[PDB]
Design a binder for this molecule. Structure first.
Ligand SMILES: CC(C)c1ccc(N2CCc3cc(O)ccc3[C@@]2(C)c2ccc(/C=C/C(=O)O)cc2)cc1
Ligand SMILES: CC(C)c1ccc(N2CCc3cc(O)ccc3[C@@]2(C)c2ccc(/C=C/C(=O)O)cc2)cc1
Lengths: 191, 177
């Protein structure tokens, strides 16, 4: 029950702040998580799901959101990873850091817009992860369809051709496989 | 190439259906036909031998798994590893079945499946130009079918997002091995 400019607006407003600071990295993660739970609650369609589902969707995607957020602010800082404005870093942390830097290098070369980013951040949450179950998942795919055509509109309003629009949508969703990859390869070392 | 010559090449490149230790053997047998399939994928041989090795090093279980989900699409609640074999592995099987369940609910067409297999290979690692060409192919077939741009976009996106689930399954499975 929302339009394109209405989805980005809801999302941009729900946007968490840029906080300040391995022990550091964890205290920053534990603090970014709380603004994420609120950001998740403010996602158009998320609060609707029951507590057992909302927790699943967040346990499944919290390290991807932390990674895409990180890759977003580090974009204008080539070779560096801006975890916080007071915590700029560089080159199993190192391999993760390289992939993280590669993703950023890419996002910058793609000229990813803040409005296009907040869409991917939501896709990462709704995508990664009885009757209640079969009906919640149906609505989740409904929301994900809304966001696809929100992104397509953003691209259309940005004067891209019909081909460019398709070719960029696939380019962004294909990055979201690598972020899952970095997410999972990171959870490995955490455990 | 062209969008109809693409799907033509892709379908003619398709590996055959072969017939724990049981599956372990089957997997290594299918890895030979997959390297074979990889060479026929338009634009793969153009790459350097180091790239070709690393793409297969990364995609090998994803390629097996997407092929498996395709084989078990018409066999609900079961996994068709081979026609002579229909069945933390309990967790992986559960996730794989859900992918067939999803590909069934979405009516995955063979022409779309061969397109996704090439995307899994070339994306899990000139590569972007070919990836755009396979994108175009998936989009052209949805247009050929007669679907609207709103639905095309929906089908393209909902399909590629299953690729992220395929990596999770790969990662989990590779962790265990
Ligand atoms: C390979 C391994 C060493 C590794 C693990 C994780 C990470 N990530 C990459 C993305 C990212 C993004 C941020 O904004 C902040 C922090 C991070 C860290 C640096 C991060 C995230 C969570 C936690 C702990 C949680 C807990 O136990 O409470 C610690 C560090 C990078 C490398
Ligand atoms: C959780 C974990 C134990 C696990 C790992 C992989 C798998 N996959 C799932 C998809 C799939 C699809 C097939 O067509 C064949 C086989 C398979 C197996 C069953 C498969 C793949 C590779 C190998 C080993 C090769 C080696 O190292 O020699 C063994 C089994 C399922 C579970």
């Amino acid at each position: 029950s929302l339009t394109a400019d209405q989805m980005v607006s809801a999302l941009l407003d729900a946007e968490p702040p840029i906080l300040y600071s391995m022990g550091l990295l964890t205290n920053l993660a534990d603090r970014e998580l709380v603004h994420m739970i609120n950001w998740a609650k403010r996602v158009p369609g998320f609060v609707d799901l029951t507590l057992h589902d909302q927790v699943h969707l967040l346990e499944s995607a919290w390290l991807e959101i932390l990674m895409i957020g990180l890759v977003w602010r580090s974009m204008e800082h080539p070779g560096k990873l801006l975890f916080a404005p007071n915590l700029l870093l560089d080159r199993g942390m190192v391999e993760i850091f390289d992939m993280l830097l590669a993703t950023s290098s890419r996002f910058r070369m793609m000229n990813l817009q803040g409005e296009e980013f907040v869409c991917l951040k939501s896709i990462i949450l709704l995508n990664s992860g009885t009757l209640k179950s079969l009906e919640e998942k149906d609505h989740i795919h409904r929301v994900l369809d809304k966001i696809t055509d929100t992104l397509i509109h953003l691209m259309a309003k940005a004067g891209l051709t019909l081909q460019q629009q398709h070719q960029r949508l696939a380019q962004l969703l294909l990055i979201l496989s690598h972020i899952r990859h970095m997410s999972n390869k990171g959870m490995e070392h955490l455990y």
